[PDB]
């Protein structure tokens, strides 16, 4: 991208005479000859001569990088080697030699983390290419190497160079490494996620909009890896990210954020509650502020439906249906809270409390005192919810249910039936 182009321009702008350094007892004359013949090697790569092009040139490039530790000569060395180190297809034969095996990939690790940001672009690209294949990047080759090399965080903190010079490069490298689950879920990547939590919140700048897109790509990569999901749950700014997505001018960024939220199909109770707050407001506004791809809008609608389904998952009507409606009384939301009791009674009493009449009829002929106890407790809550409703329940079989097992051998059923009768009496007279 722009960051990689700027880094490559800065690296290739400075020229380093390998012959002078070799004569200065820092390199070998054979190294200078190989550097001079690297142009013919590249031409033969264009001419399909793999032997001179990349085969020895992989070891030659490794030796040149190891010998030229100084960033000044490393600029020209990495500029020359960038053709092979850019990607597996770019200079395929040399790239195939570099990434052919775990040992070959680990060989570039010594070359990696060298020189400044200009060469660090190629270094990060090669690190990702080695890390793209899980076998090429063993933990000692390269999660441990990446974690112990804080040069990545340093290139990320190289603010004077540009706004997104290491940042776009690091984001692209992380996205590429997301292909390998180990690279994505490595604590090295997880550690940077917490460090990047403040960057998640604000995206005011136009450049920050691209930074916001990079953050969204990182969010998708985290959604790919379960340990990364755990780290993101530990990571903050999730509600801040939700608010930013709500105030998103770029509809593509909002769609990416919504896609990340949908990919967070896992519970994550904190983010779930935040989205529940968002679902009433953020999701509603997004539905109102439909834009860009119709497929994105459909995905947003599906995510809103999923959020609505997940909302009040614990405090759902399932418990009330299993307790009162099913006929075998159990834990019900109505008994839990008087407001929920009134809400359930509202649906229950339509015609002379038809649903409540059915519940009372079920409770009256209840052999099991425990289910009878739960039904009588629900009846007591409903009767106490409405004074006239209490008299209605007393008219219905709720008084019959209270009379049944009113002072039986069981204590819970007796207490619940007495509570129902007392609530009916309290509602009978004010």
């Amino acid at each position: 991208m722009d960051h990689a182009e700027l880094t490559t321009e800065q690296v290739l702008k400075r020229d380093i005479p390998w012959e002078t350094y070799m004569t200065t007892k820092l390199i070998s004359g054979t190294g200078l000859q190989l550097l001079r013949r690297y142009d013919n090697r590249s031409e033969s790569h264009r001419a399909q001569l793999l032997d001179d092009d990349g085969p020895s040139y992989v070891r030659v490039f490794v030796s040149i990088l190891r010998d030229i530790y100084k960033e000044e000569t490393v600029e020209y060395v990495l500029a020359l080697i960038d053709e092979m180190l850019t990607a597996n297809p770019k200079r395929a034969r040399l790239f195939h030699d570099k990434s052919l095996a775990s040992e070959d990939t680990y060989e570039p690790f010594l070359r990696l983390l060298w020189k400044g940001n200009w060469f660090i672009q190629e270094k990060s690209c090669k690190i990702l290419a080695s890390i793209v294949s899980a076998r090429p990047k063993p933990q000692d080759r390269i999660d441990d190497v990446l974690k112990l090399l804080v040069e990545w965080l340093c290139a990320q903190l190289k603010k004077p160079s540009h706004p997104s010079r290491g940042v776009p490069v690091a984001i692209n490298c992380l996205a590429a490494l997301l292909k390998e689950p180990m690279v994505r879920s490595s604590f090295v990547q997880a550690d940077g996620v917490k460090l990047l939590t403040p960057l998640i919140s604000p995206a005011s700048t136009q450049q920050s909009i691209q930074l916001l897109y990079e953050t969204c790509l990182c969010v998708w990569l985290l959604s790919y890896y379960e340990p990364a999901v755990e780290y993101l749950a530990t990571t903050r700014t999730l509600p801040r990210l939700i608010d930013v997505v709500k105030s998103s001018t770029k509809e593509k960024v909002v769609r990416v954020v919504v896609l990340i939220l949908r990919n967070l199909l896992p519970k994550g109770n904190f983010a779930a509650q935040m989205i529940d707050l968002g679902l009433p407001q953020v999701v509603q506004s997004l539905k109102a502020q439909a834009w860009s791809d119709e497929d994105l809008l459909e995905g947003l609608n599906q995510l809103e439906e999923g959020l609505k389904d997940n909302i009040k998952r614990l405090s759902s009507f399932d418990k009330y249906k299993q307790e009162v409606l099913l006929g075998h009384l159990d834990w019900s939301p109505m008994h839990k809270d008087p407001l929920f009791w009134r809400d359930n009674i509202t649906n229950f009493e339509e015609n002379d409390f038809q649903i409540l009449r059915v519940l009372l009829t079920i409770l009256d002929t209840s052999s099991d005192p425990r289910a009878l106890a739960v039904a009588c407790f629900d009846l007591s809550q409903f009767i106490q919810y409405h004074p006239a409703g209490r008299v209605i329940v007393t008219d219905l079989k709720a008084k019959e249910r209270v009379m049944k097992l009113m002072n039986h051998e069981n204590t819970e059923v007796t207490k619940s039936a007495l509570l129902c009768i007392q609530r009916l009496f309290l509602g009978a007279k004010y």
Partner: protein, 57 residues
């Protein structure tokens, strides 16, 4: 026209590059990764079954 038409053409080209490429590559990469992960999980289940058969043998 003049700067207006040139700006319009530049905007169209910018749309073509940025808007089309970003969503396209994002969708392609995400779908490829998801398919790879799901089929790897299926292959892992098959390998667990094969390991059970080998243990029986």
């Amino acid at each position: 026209n003049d700067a207006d038409v040139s700006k319009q053409i530049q905007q169209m080209v910018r749309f073509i590059r940025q808007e089309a490429e970003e969503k396209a590559n994002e969708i392609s990469v995400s779908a490829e990764e998801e398919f790879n992960i799901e089929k790897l999980q299926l292959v892992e289940a098959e390998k667990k079954k094969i390991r059970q058969e080998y243990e029986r043998k």
